[PDB]
Write a protein that binds this DNA or RNA. Sequence first.
RNA 1: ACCACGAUCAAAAGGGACAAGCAUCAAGCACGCAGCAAUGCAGCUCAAAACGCUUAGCCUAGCCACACCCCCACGGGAAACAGCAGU
Lengths: 39, 131, 123, 109, 100, 58, 51
Amino acid sequence: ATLNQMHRLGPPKRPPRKLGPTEGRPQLKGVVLCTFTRK
Amino acid sequence: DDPPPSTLLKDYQNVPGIEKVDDVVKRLLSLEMANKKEMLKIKQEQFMKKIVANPEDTRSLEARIIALSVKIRSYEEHLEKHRKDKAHKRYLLMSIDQRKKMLKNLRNTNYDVFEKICWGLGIEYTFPPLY
Amino acid sequence: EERQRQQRREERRQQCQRCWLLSHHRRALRLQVSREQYLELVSAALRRPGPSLVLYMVDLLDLPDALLPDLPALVGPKQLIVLGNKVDLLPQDAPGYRQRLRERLWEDCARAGLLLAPGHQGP
Amino acid sequence: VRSSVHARWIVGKVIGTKMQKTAKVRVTRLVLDPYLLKYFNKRKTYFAHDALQQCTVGDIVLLRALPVPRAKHVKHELAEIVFKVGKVIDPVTGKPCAGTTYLESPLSS
Amino acid sequence: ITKENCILNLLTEKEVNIVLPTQSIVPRTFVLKPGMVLFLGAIGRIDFLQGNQSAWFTVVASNILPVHITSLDRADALYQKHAGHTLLQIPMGGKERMAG
Amino acid sequence: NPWVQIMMFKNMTPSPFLRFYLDSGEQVLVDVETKSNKEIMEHIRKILGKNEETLREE
Amino acid sequence: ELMAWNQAENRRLHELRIARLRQEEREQEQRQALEQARKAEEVQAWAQRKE
RNA sequence: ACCACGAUCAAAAGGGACAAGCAUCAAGCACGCAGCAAUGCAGCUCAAAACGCUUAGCCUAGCCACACCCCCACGGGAAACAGCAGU
Ligand SMILES: [K+]
Ligand SMILES: [Mg+2]
Ligand SMILES: [Mg+2]
Ligand SMILES: [Mg+2]
Ligand SMILES: [Mg+2]
Ligand SMILES: [Mg+2]
């Protein structure tokens, strides 16, 4: 991209990072509903 | 308005003794018996006399504008008959665009000559749309 | 002023003689009558045999419609299209609420003695 | 202490003359891109009081801050016309010119 | 056909303009326990009582009709104090209107 | 000089030149035709540039 | 004093400009003389052919 | 100073500058000018991003905003630790 194009577009904009299963928290408290096994 | 058919051709108008000549040779040497290009040349010569300061200088921007204007008149006259001539439609539209460009340059460089051109050729200069 | 500009926006989303005639237009459009007065004045013309159609209009917010069971006498035995108005003013509780409203109108017609004949029916 | 207007002297091009005695002028400044460290033109519109209505679209003008604003957006007045559109006079030699060519030679005088 | 038993008959032009929604409705959710009262304007009221547990009440009405929650004991006094006026914006006209 | 308005003009006059507008309203014209860019710098520094002594006091 | 010096330098460059332009005028005169001779020859030939 | 000349400090007011995302927010709808006024002109912003929605205290010797809620607080809801300790 030319200098004019980079001036127009501006600095690169990193998308917001995706929240995981913990929604960005170290731990979470939960209540067990049922126990089972998976293969 | 077109030049009278009895007017002599541009090349046979300064030859000495052209007034001492028989009527038949005058007819042979007139716009009556020439194709349209000589009539357009006569129109161009008349406009050059009427508008520009130096009618002999043909490389000036005003001269080019006058030439393109007579060409545009020719294209409009042609398209008045051949309504479905797409090639000459393209040529007319283009020629109008470049005459607008030349008028813009003349306005930005020489306003007095620009006014004289716009009055002489009956051109109404219009500013381009913003969007 | 604020509501005026708001209704201007809604209109945007939608996209001597004249004076008194427009006044008559408003007055004639705004005419209203009672139910029994309707039965004794307007039903006669609407029960003339021929080719006809009724665009019955019902306000979605104001349901059930107590006028719906009375249509057989009001208009007669002719073709009827029910139009639920003011659907834009309804909050979207869940996806496909419009289908639920259409169905509910269908059962509301069914509860009354109205024949439901949607779509192609036969010769 | 001579005026309450921030921009005191500014040069611009006239882009509008549809107002009565007011010219809409375009003023360009050079702004440094903090990342690229290249200078780009930033444009700003100003309204200049033109008492005599002598502005034409395209001419380069100089504007002087008024002692106080005379209107909501009119804060400057036309001090002079630096370059009249199509009627430029070469400041160095004082002769009329058309673009880069002299309309009249300096030697004529 | 004119609807019988309609509030809009009783209300005046301005009050009808306020009550009738003109923009899309936004719901308003309120969790109520037994012994509480909901006021929709001065026109509607709901008393919740003898309930084994809490419940949720979602008001779908014009965005410019106030919804006010109170206890059962204070509901009557509040209604008399603020009938008309601005807390319960419909109807309007102070105590003169509420006579009719 | 971040607060000084610098503006450019192309092919409007037969000769190049610089023009300075001062706070008093005065105009200073500096013809730069036939001059080198370093000469232009030295000239403008000499006529309208703060001397080294003033910078040292600042 | 600095403004006076700037004016003096402008006048000096103006004198140099006059010198250069007088030179250019002289070579332009001789060039256009030659070109006008060529144009005169062409005009004579063309006009005689038309006669 | 204390008599103010005026310095320091700093409101209101005028000019300028001043975060991020989204154009699947592209038109805004009176946003301008001239005249002592009467009134006249039809203008103003905008793809160099107007108008709009969403997000976030900020540019930290510190600054801005708020002080239960109704932006505000005559009035009303209603009875207040976002002062310290504490629950
Ligand atoms: K607050
Ligand atoms: Mg202030
Ligand atoms: Mg926040
Ligand atoms: Mg408060
Ligand atoms: Mg505490
Ligand atoms: Mg608290």
